[PDB]
Design a binder for these strands. Structure first.
Ligand code: MG
Lengths: 586, 1340, 49
DNA sequence: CCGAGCAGCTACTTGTGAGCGGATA
DNA sequence: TATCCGCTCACAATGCCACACGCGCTGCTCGGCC
C-alpha cells in the first residue's frame, strides 16, 4: 500500500523515499522492457537476457543480498528489501511488535530520596504535570473551573495557582511505574506512589536502587502511567515495592540494607571500653535517647539498662517480660525502632551487614509483611540520621602502614636474591626457580596482609580506671570494611598493604610483584603492570554484556511457552535430591 | 629566568627528578603530517609527489602522446579561517599543477617529441589545516584521527587450540602489501602446504612457484638438501655427515673404514656424533631396503633408450633401483628427510600438484582467480604478471619493504614495490622452518608489527584513488587526441579527485568535528589513535587480543586513557613524548646510559629495538654524575620487569610522564589511584563544560601550563612587544624595535572571538588578561580563552569539600551542594543553540522572509524587526515566531501595488502558509547573534546590509589604526627632513601640516626629498584603499548555499543554565555523582571558625572504588587554601612588602629538595604585590604524575600555616548546632560539571505525533515523543501479572489507531475503562507478509 | 492503509525464499540439486520437459 | 515536452550448524 | 555404495540516550491519450 511505503516531501524538490520504492520501480521497468521486447519478437538471446534481468530484479525485491550480489540504490550502501523489514533487530517483530514506544511516559536522571517511605517515591512537578494531562483535564471539567477542554488546556499551559491542587489530588493514590534502562528480572519495573517535588530529577528510595542495580553516578530511568483502574489496582497489588521484598531467584530478601545505613548502625552498636556515662543505669530506651541527645553521655558505652521485650506465644499472644540487660547505649536507643515481636538478642550485636540482613529476615518471618516495611523504613531513617551525626570520614592518617612491612619486604628480597643465586649456580632450572619465586612472594604477601590486619586492629587502648584495655579498633576505614558496608578484605589489603602479584597478557603471573601500596607512592613500572592487568577485567564486562543479553533473549525465547495451568498432575516420579559433597566437604 | 606569565603567578611545584627533555608540541603529530603532505619534495617522497610520479606520466595506446608532470603549487586560500567559520565555506586552497603534453607524429617510437604543450591546470581544491591541526569543511572544524593498522610486510600467525580440533599447531604466513593483492601460505591438518590469493580457493604452492618459470629440480634444490648415493661395486654406498643423522635410530650396522661405529638399533647420540666426526669419514655401507624409503630429487634421463627411468617425488622401488644402476648414473641425488630438521612438506604438495608445466599452471591459477573464461597461455600470464609484479597493482611502500627485509634477516633494507621470486622462496623457506621448530611466530600484539598512519597518508591514498580514475579518463580520452587539436587542460576534469578529497575530508569513519568544549578534549582528540575505519578492524569483530595492552606500549601509547564502552582498547591516545617515526612507527625518547654516567642526550627508540637494549626505571633513585645510588636497579629487558646491575643498563627514561597521556597527566597524585578510577576520571575530564568564570586549579600538575598554550584556544604572542590597546573585542600590541620588521612593518592585532556556538552547543569566549603598557614577550598569553586562567588550564572549580554522610543525601554516589555555590554564580554555564531557516526555491513562487504574518496578533510579532527577523537581544521562552518565513501556495504574480494594499488595506495575504520557523517548545534564553547568507542574485535584506556594514566597520577600524600608525611615522619622517626650513615649519606646520604638505624651496635636494615622501604617502594611501576595497568585495560577495535556495538565516539562542539537582559532577579521580539536593547555607555543616563547607561527598566511595589519591589531593588543596588565607590576613591588614616577600620565600622554599628553586629577591619589588594579590585565592601547587609530593611534604606544608597537621578538623552541624565527633576531614577539591545536564535529559509526553510508516508514538527529546517499552520490559511485565497493563501499554497507549482516541475521550470524561481493539503495527506486518508470496489469514 | 494492488508479470518467476532456504523447498520437492535449479533459473543451461 | 531508465566515468571474527561433494573401504 | 571428512554458505552478536550529517551526474534513448 502506498502510504505504508516511506515517501515524504523533504525540504525542497527532493523527497525522502524508501528502498522498496526503488525496488518496485526497477521491477516495473524491467517488466515493461520485457513486454516491449516480446512484442517486437526479439531474438532468443535478448529475451532470455531480459528474463534473467527481470528475475534478478524480482528476487532482489524479495530478498536483496541473498542471491549473492547486494545491489545498492544510493550512498553505495546495501539496499533494504522486504525480508530486511522483518528479520534482525530492526524488523517488525523486534522493533514494532514486541517492544513499542508508549505514550504517557517520561525519562529522567535518578536522585537519592532519603525522606520518602519505601512504598512511595518522588516525581518532578513538571513531569507529573505533563504525564497526567488528561486526568487534570477531567478533574477541571468536573469542578466548576473549566467548562471545555480549551480552557483547561490554557490554564494548564499558564499553570495558575488553581491547577496545582488538582495535580496533587490526581496523584493522591495513583501510582506510577519506575523502570531501569537495562531490565534483568522482575524488579526491573516497580510501582510507586509519587509525591510532587520541585525540580527536574526523580527522587528514588535508597533501599530499592540496590535491587535496581542503579548507581547515582548519572543513571537515567523511565516512568510510566497505569492509566486504568485495573492497571492501578494491579500496580498497587503486585508491582508495588512492598509486595516485592523477596527475590524470585532466591529466598534472600532483596531489600538488604546498603552501605550507609549499615555503617551508621555499626558505629551506633560498636561499643567501646570507656566513654561518657560508662557504668550508670537507665530506665528505658527513651531515657537513654534523652541522655544521649542531651550530650551528657556518649553514644557507645557499656550501660545496664532495663528492656521490656515481647515474645510471641504459640497462639497470637505477645507475652511481655521486663529484664535488666547490660548493653551499649546505641543498641538501647535502636531498640525503640524494632517491633515488639523480635527478641533482644538480635540487637545485642555489632549489627553488621549480615547481622541486619538476618534481623530483617527474622522480622519478616515472625511478624509477616505489614510491619516489616515500616521497620525497614525506620531502620533506614535512623541509620542515615546517626551516620550523619557520627561523622565517619576516611583520612590519610586513618590508613596505617605496618611498621614491620619493611623488614618483611627485605627478607623477601633476600630470599629471591638467594633463589637467583641458586639459579645462576646451575642447580635449579628456570621453571622451578619461577615457581619458588612465585610461592615465596605469595607467602610474603599473605604474611604482610595478616600483619596489616592485626595492625589495623590494635593500637586502640583506652584507660577505664586502669592501665590498658585494648579493644576493637575504631578506625573509620576499619569500621567501613569490617562492617561489610563498602570495603572488603582484599580491597583494604590492596589499599594499605602491598598489592601483591599481577598478570601478564596470556594469563600467567609476573615474577616481579608490586611491593608498594596506594597510600605510599606507586612506581611507574608497577602502575603500568597494574593498569595492564586491570584493563583486561575492565574490557571483560564491556564485552560480556552483549553475550549476556543474547543469552537472556535466547533463554526467554525458550521460556514463556508454559504457565501454571493445573493444580495437580497426579504422578509420583521425581528426582533424588541429595547434598552434593564432591571435592571438599560439602 | 622565568617567562612573564610565570612572573604573573608562579605555581609552586614538587618533585625531585630534574627533567632533561621539555614538553614537546602536543599537536606536533598532525602539524608535521600535513607539513609532509603539502611541500615540494624531490625523489618522489611522501606527500603529493609520490602519487604523481607513480601515476604520471601517462602514455596512450602506443600513440607517441605522453602527458608529463612538472610540479604543483597551492594557491592562496580564498577565505580566511574566520571567514570560513562565519560563512560555512571550506578553508581550502587551489591545486595548480604544471603538466606537459608531449605528442609526436607516427612512424617514430623514439622520435624526439615536438609541439610540446606545457600548461598549468587547476584540478580541484584541497582543504588546509589551521595552525591547530583542524580542517574546516562546512563551517565546523573537523579533525582527522590517526589510524593504527597492520604494518605492510609479512607476518607469521600460529593457529592453536580449537583450530581444526586436531590438536596440531598450524603456522600461516601472510604477505600483505600496502596497496595491492594479498598472499597467504598455510598448512593443512596434514603435512600439506597450500597458498591462496586474497581468501580464494586453497591450492598448493608448487603450482604458483612453478608459474615463475620454475622446474621441479630447481624447486627441490632450493628447498631441500642433497644426499649422494654412489654406484659402487655393491651395496650402493653413500656420503654421510654425523650431523644429519642426529635423532634417528640405526636400522643397519653403520660401520666405515673396517671399524664398527653404530650397531643396528642404536640411536646416534651426541657422543656417537663426536666419535663419527673424530675420524672424518664420509662413505659407509648401507643396505638395499634403506634406499627404498628415500626419494629421488632430479629427473634422470636414460642415454641408451632415451626414456625417463623415474621422475621426481616418487619413492624408489627395487626395479627402479636396478634400472637406474644399469643406466649408468653413478651419482644419485635424493632428498634428506628428517621430521626434526627438514619435515617433508614440498613432496606432498608436489604429489598433489595436478599441473607440471608453466602453461597449465598459469591457466589453472587464472581459472582459480577468475571463474570461467579459459584463455591461452599468453593471455593468462598477463593476469599473473600484472597482479603481483606490476607497480600499479602492487604498492609495497618503503616501510613495507623495510619490514619485509627485516623479518627475513636481510642486510639491505631497500627495494622495489613489486615482489620477486626470491622473496617468495625465502618466505616459503621461513614458513617451513617455523613449522619445523626453528624461528618463532610474530604476534599481532606488538607495536613493531602495528603501523600508524596520519592524516597525510590517508589524504595521499584518497588522492591516488581519485587519480587512478582521472588517469583512466585521460587515457580513454587520449585515444582520439592528435597533434594540434587540444591544450593539456580540457582532457582533465576536476570532478573525480576534488570530489574524492571532499568526501574523504567531510564524510568518513575518521573525519569528525572536534569536541570543542575545552582545550583538553581538543588535545586528546587530535592525539587520538583509532583501529576502526578502512583497513582497520571493526569493534563488532574484535577479539580479546587487540583490546589488551602490551608491555611494548610503554611510553608509546597511554594504557589508562581509553573510552570505556563499545570500544575499549581500540581507541587510544598517544603518549606525551611519543613521536612518529619516519617509516610510520611509534618512537619513544630515551637517555643514553654509559658505563658510569648517564649523558643528557636523547635517542628516539622504535618498538622493535626495545628488546635489544634495556630501559632503566623512570623514578629510580639516581646519584650525581649520572650515577645510581644503588648497584642493583629495576629495569626491563623484553617487556619483563627485573633487577639488573648499574653497568649492564644502556638506556634510561627521559622523565616520569611519558607513560601517561596528556589527558591523564593532569590527574594529580595519579600514583595513588587505581586503573579503573583513573580511566574513568580521565574520560570524564574530557567532558568538562567551561564555567562562567574560570579559576586556577589548586592541586595542579604543571602540565596545565602547556596544554593551555600549545593549543590554539588562547591568544598567543607571535611577537613580543608593548601593549598598546586593550579591549574586550580586540587587542592591539606594538612590536618592539628589534622584533619589528625593518620595512613595511607596524603593530599586531588579535581579534578576540566573542560568545559563539561551539561544536557541542557550548560557549567559547576569550577574555583579555593584560593591562595597558604592560610589556609582553613572544609566545606569552594575552587573552584567556574558555576555561583558562593566565595561560593555565582551568576546567572546573575549587570548592571546600568534606567527607561525611549527611542524612543519606550522599547515599551511594550523590553529591551534596550548598546554596552558596549556586548563589556565587559558580557552576552556571552558557549553552548556545543554532536554529536555521532556509528560503528554498520551490514552484508557484519562492519563499519570503517578510514580516507580514497573518492569522496572528502583534504580541507574537512584537519581537520581529522591520525585515522579518528577531532583534539581537530579544528574549524568548516558549514557542514564538522569530523569523517571518512564508511560502506561496497558489497563484504567482501578486502585483506589488496589491501587495502593499494587503499590507495596509484589504484582506490578508493568502499564499503564505504560515510556514515561519519558531523556537521549539521547551528551549529558552535570549538570542545573541543572527547570520544570513544570500545567493548571488537575490535582493539582500537591510539586516544583511547592517551586518555586513558592521563587519566592514570593524575591518575599517583595524585598517585605520594601521594606516594612522604608518602615517604618523611618515609625518615624523617629513618633519625630520624639512628641519632645514625650520622657521616656516614651526610657524605654519604645527596645526596645518597634517593637510598642507605642499611646500617648495631650494630644488636641488628639497624638491627630490619632498617628492619621494609625497610618493610614499600616496602609494601607502592607495595600497590601503585597495586593501579596504578588497575586504569590502570579499565580505559582500554572496556565497553559494544549495541548488534551489534563496537565502539561509541562522540564529544563535544562548541560555544561562545554572546548577540544579540532576546535573552530573565529578572530581579528577573518577568520583562521579549527581547533585542530590541543594541545601541552605544554614543547614550545611560549618567549622569551629564559621566557614561553611560547600560540598559534602560520601567517604564510603573511597574503599571499594580504590581512588585514594583524591583524598591526598584534597588535603593538599586545604594546605593551599590555608596559605592563601595567610596571604589574605597579610593583604587586608596593610603589611610591609618585606614580610610578604619573606613569607612567599618561606612558602616556595619548602623542605623537599624540589627542582623549582624560585627566589623572590630577583623580582622588581612591585610585581610581588600583584603576585600576592593573585595568590589570595590560594597557592597553586604543581604535582608530577609520579614524582608528586609525599605525605611528609604535605604535612610540613600544612604545618607551615596554622591549619592542623592531621588534616581532619572538628565540624559543627548546621541543623542541630552541635559538635560532630570523630573529626571529619575537609579540604579544597577541584571538581568538574559534566556535559550531562539534566535540562537535556528530563523529558515526557502525554500525547504527541505518530510515525507515518506505522501509527506508533515517537520518542526523543527534540521531538515531543515518549519512551520505548523495551523487550526486556515486556518480559519483566509478563513475568508479573498485569495482563491488562501490558495489553493497554502495547496497543491502547501506542498502536491502536481508534483505541487511543477513545481512551483519551473516556479519561477526559471520567471513564477509566478501555477497549482492546487491535495493534496497528500488527496489521502493518499482516499487509507486509501479504505483499510477499505468502498468505496469512485470521480465523473466525 | 489496507488496499493493495498488483503487477501482472509477463514471464513467471520463482520465489527466492523457496529457492534459498537451505534446504530449499524446490530443491527437495523436485529431487533435483539446487545447483541445477540455479543454473536453470539464471538462464545458462536447459532442462528438458 | 516530460518523464523515466540506464550507461560511461570486499576481504583480523569466530563460532555453530547445515549442505555438497569426495574418496576409500 | 555407506559414511566420515573437508570445503562452503547462512546466520548471530545488548539496550537506551544525546548530537551531527546524508540521497550518482550528465547524458542518451524510448515511450504516453488534450
Ligand atoms: Mg551508573
Amino acid at each position: 500500500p502506498p502510504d505504508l511505503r516511506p515517501l515524504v516531501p523533504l525540504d525542497g524538490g527532493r523527497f525522502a523515499t524508501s528502498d522498496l520504492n526503488d525496488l518496485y520501480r526497477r521491477v516495473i521497468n524491467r517488466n515493461n522492457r520485457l513486454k516491449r521486447l516480446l512484442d517486437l519478437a526479439a531474438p532468443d538471446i535478448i529475451v532470455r537476457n531480459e528474463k534473467r534481468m527481470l528475475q534478478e530484479a524480482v528476487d532482489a525485491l524479495l530478498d536483496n543480498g541473498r542471491r549473492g550480489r547486494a545491489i545498492t540504490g544510493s550512498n553505495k550502501r546495501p539496499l533494504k528489501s522486504l525480508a530486511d523489514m522483518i528479520k534482525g533487530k530492526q524488523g517488525r517483530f523486534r522493533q514494532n511488535l514486541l517492544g513499542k514506544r508508549v505514550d504517557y511516559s517520561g525519562r529522567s536522571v535518578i536522585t537519592v530520596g532519603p525522606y520518602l517511605r519505601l512504598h512511595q517515591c518522588g516525581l518532578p512537578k513538571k513531569m507529573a504535570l505533563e504525564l497526567f494531562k488528561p486526568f487534570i483535564y477531567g478533574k477541571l471539567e468536573l469542578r466548576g473551573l473549566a467548562t471545555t477542554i480549551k480552557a483547561a488546556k490554557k490554564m494548564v499551559e499558564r499553570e495558575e495557582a488553581v491547577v496545582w491542587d488538582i495535580l496533587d489530588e490526581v496523584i493522591r493514590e495513583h501510582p506510577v511505574l519506575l523502570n531501569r534502562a537495562p531490565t534483568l528480572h522482575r524488579l526491573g519495573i516497580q510501582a510507586f506512589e509519587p509525591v510532587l517535588i520541585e525540580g527536574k530529577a526523580i527522587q528514588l528510595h535508597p533501599l530499592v536502587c540496590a535491587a535496581y542495580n542503579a548507581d547515582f553516578d548519572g543513571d537515567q530511568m523511565a516512568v510510566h502511567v497505569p492509566l486504568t483502574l485495573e492497571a492501578q489496582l494491579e500496580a498497587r497489588a503486585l508491582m508495588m515495592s512492598t509486595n516485592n521484598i523477596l527475590s524470585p531467584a532466591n529466598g534472600e530478601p532483596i531489600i538488604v540494607p546498603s552501605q550507609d545505613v549499615v555503617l551508621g548502625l555499626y558505629y551506633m552498636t560498636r561499643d567501646c571500653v570507656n566513654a561518657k556515662g560508662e557504668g550508670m543505669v537507665l530506665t528505658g530506651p527513651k531515657e537513654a535517647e534523652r541522655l544521649y541527645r542531651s550530650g551528657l553521655a556518649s553514644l557507645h558505652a557499656r550501660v545496664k539498662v532495663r528492656i521490656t521485650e515481647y515474645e510471641k506465644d504459640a497462639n497470637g499472644e505477645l507475652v511481655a517480660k521486663t529484664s535488666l540487660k547490660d548493653t551499649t547505649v546505641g543498641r538501647a536507643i535502636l531498640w525503640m525502632i524494632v517491633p515488639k515481636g523480635l527478641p533482644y538478642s538480635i540487637v545485642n550485636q555489632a549489627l553488621g551487614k549480615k547481622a541486619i540482613s538476618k534481623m530483617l529476615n527474622t522480622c519478616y518471618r515472625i511478624l509477616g509483611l505489614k510491619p516489616t516495611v515500616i521497620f525497614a523504613d525506620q531502620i533506614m531513617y535512623t541509620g542515615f540520621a546517626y551516620a550523619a551525626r557520627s561523622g565517619a570520614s576516611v583520612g590519610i592518617d586513618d590508613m596505617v602502614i605496618p611498621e614491620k612491612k619493611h623488614e618483611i619486604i627485605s627478607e623477601a628480597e633476600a630470599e629471591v636474591a638467594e633463589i637467583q643465586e641458586q639459579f645462576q649456580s646451575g642447580l635449579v632450572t628456570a621453571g622451578e626457580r619461577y615457581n619458588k619465586v612465585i610461592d615465596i612472594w605469595a607467602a610474603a604477601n599473605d604474611r604482610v596482609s595478616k600483619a596489616m590486619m592485626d595492625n589495623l586492629q590494635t593500637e586502640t587502648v583506652i584507660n577505664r580506671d586502669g592501665q590498658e584495655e585494648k579493644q576493637v579498633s575504631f578506625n573509620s576505614i576499619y569500621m567501613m570494611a569490617d562492617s561489610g558496608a563498602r570495603g572488603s578484605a582484599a580491597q583494604i589489603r590492596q589499599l594499605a598493604g602491598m598489592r601483591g602479584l599481577m598478570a601478564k597478557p596470556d594469563g600467567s603471573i609476573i615474577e616481579t610483584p608490586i611491593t608498594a601500596n596506594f597510600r605510599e607512592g606507586l612506581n611507574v613500572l608497577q602502575y603500568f603492570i597494574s593498569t595492564h592487568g586491570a584493563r583486561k577485567g575492565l574490557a571483560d564486562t564491556a564485552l560480556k554484556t552483549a553475550n549476556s543479553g543474547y543469552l537472556t533473549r535466547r533463554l526467554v525465547d525458550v521460556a514463556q511457552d508454559l504457565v501454571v495451568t493445573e493444580d495437580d498432575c497426579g504422578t509420583h516420579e521425581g528426582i533424588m535430591m541429595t547434598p552434593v559433597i564432591e571435592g571438599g566437604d560439602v | 629566568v622565568y617567562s612573564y606569565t610565570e612572573k604573573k603567578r608562579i605555581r609552586k611545584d614538587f618533585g625531585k627528578r630534574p627533567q632533561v627533555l621539555d614538553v614537546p608540541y602536543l599537536l606536533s603529530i598532525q602539524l608535521d603530517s600535513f607539513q609532509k603532505f603539502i611541500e615540494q619534495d624531490p625523489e618522489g617522497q611522501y606527500g603529493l609527489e609520490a602519487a604523481f610520479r607513480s601515476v604520471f606520466p601517462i602514455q596512450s595506446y602506443s600513440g607517441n602522446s605522453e602527458l608529463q608532470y612538472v610540479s604543483y603549487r597551492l594557491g592562496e586560500p580564498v577565505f580566511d579561517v574566520q571567514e570560513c567559520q562565519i560563512r560555512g565555506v571550506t578553508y581550502s586552497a587551489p591545486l595548480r599543477v604544471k603538466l606537459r603534453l608531449v605528442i609526436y607524429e607516427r612512424e617514430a617510437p623514439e622520435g624526439t617529441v615536438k609541439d610540446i604543450k606545457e600548461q598549468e591546470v587547476y584540478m580541484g581544491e584541497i582543504p588546509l589545516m589551521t595552525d591547530n591541526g583542524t580542517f574546516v569543511i562546512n563551517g565546523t572544524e573537523r579533525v582527522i584521527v590517526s589510524q593504527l593498522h597492520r604494518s605492510p610486510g609479512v607476518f607469521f600467525d600460529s593457529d592453536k587450540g580449537k583450530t581444526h580440533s586436531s590438536g596440531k599447531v598450524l603456522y600461516n604466513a601472510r604477505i600483505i602489501p600496502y596497496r595491492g593483492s594479498w598472499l597467504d601460505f598455510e598448512f593443512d591438518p596434514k603435512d600439506n602446504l597450500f597458498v591462496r590469493i586474497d581468501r580464494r580457493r586453497k591450492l598448493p604452492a608448487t603450482i604458483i612457484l612453478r608459474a615463475l618459470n620454475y622446474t621441479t629440480e630447481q624447486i627441490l634444490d632450493l628447498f631441500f638438501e642433497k644426499v649422494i648415493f654412489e654406484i659402487r661395486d655393491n651395496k650402493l654406498q653413500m656420503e654421510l655427515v654425523p650431523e644429519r643423522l642426529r635423532g634417528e635410530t640405526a636400522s643397519f650396522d653403520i660401520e666405515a673404514n673396517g671399524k664398527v661405529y653404530v650397531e643396528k638399533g642404536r640411536r646416534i647420540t651426541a657422543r656417537h656424533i663426536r666419535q663419527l666426526e673424530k675420524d672424518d669419514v664420509k662413505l659407509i655401507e648401507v643396505p638395499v631396503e634403506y634406499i627404498a624409503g628415500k626419494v629421488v630429487a632430479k629427473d634422470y634421463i636414460d642415454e641408451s633408450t632415451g626414456e625417463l627411468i623415474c621422475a621426481a617425488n616418487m619413492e624408489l622401488s627395487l626395479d627402479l633401483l636396478a634400472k637406474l644402476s644399469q643406466s649408468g648414473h653413478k651419482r644419485i641425488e635424493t632428498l634428506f628427510t628428517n621430521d626434526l630438521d627438514h619435515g617433508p612438506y614440498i613432496s606432498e604438495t608436489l604429489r598433489v600438484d595436478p599441473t607440471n608445466d608453466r602453461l597449465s599452471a598459469l591457466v589453472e591459477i587464472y581459472r582459480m582467480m577468475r571463474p570461467g573464461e579459459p584463455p591461452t597461455r599468453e593471455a593468462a600470464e598477463s593476469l599473473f604478471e600484472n597482479l603481483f609484479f606490476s607497480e600499479d597493482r602492487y604498492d609495497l611502500s618503503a616501510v613495507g619493504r623495510m619490514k619485509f627485509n627485516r623479518s627475513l634477516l636481510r642486510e639491505e633494507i631497500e627495494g622495489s614495490g613489486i615482489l620477486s621470486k626470491d622473496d617468495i622462496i625465502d618466505v616459503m623457506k621461513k614458513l617451513i622452518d617455523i613449522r619445523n621448530g626453528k624461528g618463532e611466530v610474530d604476534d599481532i600484539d606488538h607495536l613493531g608489527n602495528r603501523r600508524i598512519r596520519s592524516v597525510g597518508e590517508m589524504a595521499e591514498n584518497q588522492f591516488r584513488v581519485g587519480l587512478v580514475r582521472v588517469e583512466r579518463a585521460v587515457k580513454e580520452r587520449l585515444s582520439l587526441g592528435d597533434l594540434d587539436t587540444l591544450m593539456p587542460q580540457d582532457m582533465i576534469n576536476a570532478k573525480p579527485i576534488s570530489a574524492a578529497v571532499k568526501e574523504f575530508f567531510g564524510s568518513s569513519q575518521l573525519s569528525q568535528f572536534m569536541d570543542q568544549n575545552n582545550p583538553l578534549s581538543e588535545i586528546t582528540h587530535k592525539r587520538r589513535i583509532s583501529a576502526l575505519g578502512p583497513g582497520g578492524l571493526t569493534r563488532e569483530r574484535a577479539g580479546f587480543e587487540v583490546r589488551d595492552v602490551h608491555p611494548t606500549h610503554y611510553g608509546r601509547v597511554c594504557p589508562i586513557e581509553t573510552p570505556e564502552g563499545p570500544n575499549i582498547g581500540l581507541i587510544n591516545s598517544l603518549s606525551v613524548y611519543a613521536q612518529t617515526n619516519e617509516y610510520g612507527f611509534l618512537e619513544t625518547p630515551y637517555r643514553k646510559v654509559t658505563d658510569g654516567v648517564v649523558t643528557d642526550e636523547i635517542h628516539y627508540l622504535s618498538a622493535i629495538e626495545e628488546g635489544n637494549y634495556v630501559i632503566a626505571q623512570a623514578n629510580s633513585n639516581l646519584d650525581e654524575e649520572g650515577h645510581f645510588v644503588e648497584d642493583l636497579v629495576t629495569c626491563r629487558s623484553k617487556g619483563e620487569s627485573s633487577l639488573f646491575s648499574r653497568d649492564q643498563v644502556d638506556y634510561m627514561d627521559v622523565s616520569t610522564q611519558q607513560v601517561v597521556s596528556v589527558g591523564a597527566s593532569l590527574i594529580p597524585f595519579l600514583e595513588h589511584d587505581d586503573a579503573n578510577r583513573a580511566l574513568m576520571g580521565a574520560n570524564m575530564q574530557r567532558q568538562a563544560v567551561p564555567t562562567l568564570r574560570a579559576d586556577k586549579p589548586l592541586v595542579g600538575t604543571g602540565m596545565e601550563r602547556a596544554v593551555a598554550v600549545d593549543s590554539g584556544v588562547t591568544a598567543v604572542a607571535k611577537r613580543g612587544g608593548v601593549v598598546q590597546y586593550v579591549d574586550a573585542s580586540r587587542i592591539v600590541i606594538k612590536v618592539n624595535e628589534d622584533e619589528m620588521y625593518p620595512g613595511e612593518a607596524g603593530i599586531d592585532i588579535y581579534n578576540l572571538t566573542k560568545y559563539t556556538r561551539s561544536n557541542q552547543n557550548t560557549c567559547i569566549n576569550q577574555m583579555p588578561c593584560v593591562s595597558l603598557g604592560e610589556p609582553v614577550e613572544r609566545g606569552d598569553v594575552l587573552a584567556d580563552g574558555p576555561s583558562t586562567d593566565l595561560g593555565e588550564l582551568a576546567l572546573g572549580q575549587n570548592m571546600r569539600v568534606a567527607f561525611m554522610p549527611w542524612n543519606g543525601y550522599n547515599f551511594e554516589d550523590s553529591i551534596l551542594v550548598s546554596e552558596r555555590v549556586v548563589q556565587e554564580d559558580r557552576f552556571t554555564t552558557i549553552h548556545i543553540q543554532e536554529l536555521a531557516c532556509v528560503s528554498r526555491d520551490t514552484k508557484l513562487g519562492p519563499e519570503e522572509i517578510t514580516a507580514d504574518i497573518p492569522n496572528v496578533g502583534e504580541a507574537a510579532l512584537s519581537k520581529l524587526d522591520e525585515s522579518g527577523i528577531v532583534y539581537i537581544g530579544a528574549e524568548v521562552t516558549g514557542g514564538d515566531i522569530l523569523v517571518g518565513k512564508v511560502t506561496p501556495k497558489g497563484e504567482t504574480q501578486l502585483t506589488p501595488e496589491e501587495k502593499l494594499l494587503r499590507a495596509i488595506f484589504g484582506e490578508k495575504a493568502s499564499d503564505v502558509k504560515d510556514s515561519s520557523l519558531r523556537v521549539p517548545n521547551g528551549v529558552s534564553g535570549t538570542v545573541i547573534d543572527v547570520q544570513v547568507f544570500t545567493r548571488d542574485g537575490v535582493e539582500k535584506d537591510k539586516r544583511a546590509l547592517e551586518i555586513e556594514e558592521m563587519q566592514l566597520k570593524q575591518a575599517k577600524k583595524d585598517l585605520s589604526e594601521e594606516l594612522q600608525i604608518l602615517e604618523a611615522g611618515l609625518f615624523s619622517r617629513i618633519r625630520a627632513v624639512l628641519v632645514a626650513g625650520g622657521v616656516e615649519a614651526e610657524k605654519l606646520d604645527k596645526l596645518p601640516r597634517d593637510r598642507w604638505l605642499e611646500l617648495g624651496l631650494t630644488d636641488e635636494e628639497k624638491q627630490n626629498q619632498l617628492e619621494q615622501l609625497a610618493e610614499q604617502y600616496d602609494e601607502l594611501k592607495h595600497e590601503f584603499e585597495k586593501k579596504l576595497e578588497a575586504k569590502r568585495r570579499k565580505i559582500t560577495q554572496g556565497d553559494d548555499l544549495a541548488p534551489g535556495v534563496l537565502k539561509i538565516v541562522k540564529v544563535y539562542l544562548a541560555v544561562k543554565r545554572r546548577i540544579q539537582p540532576g546535573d552530573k559532577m565529578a572530581g579528577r579521580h573518577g568520583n562521579k555523582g549527581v547533585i542530590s539536593k541543594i541545601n541552605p547555607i544554614e543547614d550545611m555543616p560549618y567549622d569551629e571558625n564559621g566557614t561553611p563547607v560547600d560540598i559534602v561527598l560520601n567517604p564510603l566511595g573511597v574503599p571499594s572504588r580504590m581512588n585514594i589519591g583524591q583524598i591526598l589531593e584534597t588535603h593538599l588543596g586545604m594546605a593551599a587554601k590555608g596559605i592563601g588565607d595567610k596571604i589574605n590576613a597579610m593583604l587586608k591588614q596593610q603589611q610591609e612588602v618585606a614580610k610578604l616577600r619573606e613569607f612567599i620565600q618561606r612558602a616556595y622554599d619548602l623542605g623537599a629538595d624540589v627542582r623549582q628553586k624560585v627566589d623572590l629577591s630577583t623580582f622588581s619589588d612591585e610585581e610581588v604585590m600583584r603576585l600576592a594579590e593573585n595568590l589570595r585565592k590560594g597557592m597553586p601547587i604543581a604535582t608530577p604524575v609520579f614524582d608528586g609530593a609525599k605525605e611528609a611534604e604535605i604535612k610540613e606544608l600544612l604545618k607551615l600555616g596554622d591549619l592542623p597537621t592531621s588534616g581532619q578538623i572538628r565540624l559543627y552541624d548546621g541543623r542541630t548546632g552541635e559538635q560532630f565527633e570523630r573529626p571529619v576531614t575537609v579540604g579544597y577539591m577541584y571538581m568538574l560539571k559534566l556535559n550531562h545536564l539534566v535540562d537535556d535529559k528530563m523529558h515526557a509526553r502525554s500525547t504527541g505525533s505518530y510515525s507515518l510508516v506505522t501509527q506508533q508514538p515517537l520518542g526523543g527529546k527534540a521531538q515531543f515523543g515518549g519512551q520505548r517499552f523495551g523487550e526486556m520490559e515486556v518480559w519483566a511485565l509478563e513475568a508479573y501479572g498485569a495482563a491488562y497493563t501490558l495489553q493497554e501499554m502495547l496497543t491502547v497507549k501506542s498502536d491502536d489507531v481508534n483505541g487511543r482516541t477513545k481512551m483519551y475521550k473516556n479519561i477526559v470524561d471520567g471513564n477509566h475503562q478501555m477497549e482492546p481493539g487491535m495493534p496497528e503495527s500488527f496489521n502493518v506486518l499482516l499487509k507486509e507478509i501479504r505483499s510477499l508470496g505468502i498468505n496469512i489469514e485470521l480465523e473466525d | 492503509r489496507e488496499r493493495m494492488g498488483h503487477i501482472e508479470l509477463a514471464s513467471p518467476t520463482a520465489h527466492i525464499w523457496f529457492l534459498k532456504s537451505l534446504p530449499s523447498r524446490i530443491g527437495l520437492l523436485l529431487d533435483m540439486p539446487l545447483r541445477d535449479i540455479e543454473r536453470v533459473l539464471y538462464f545458462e543451461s536447459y532442462v528438458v520437459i
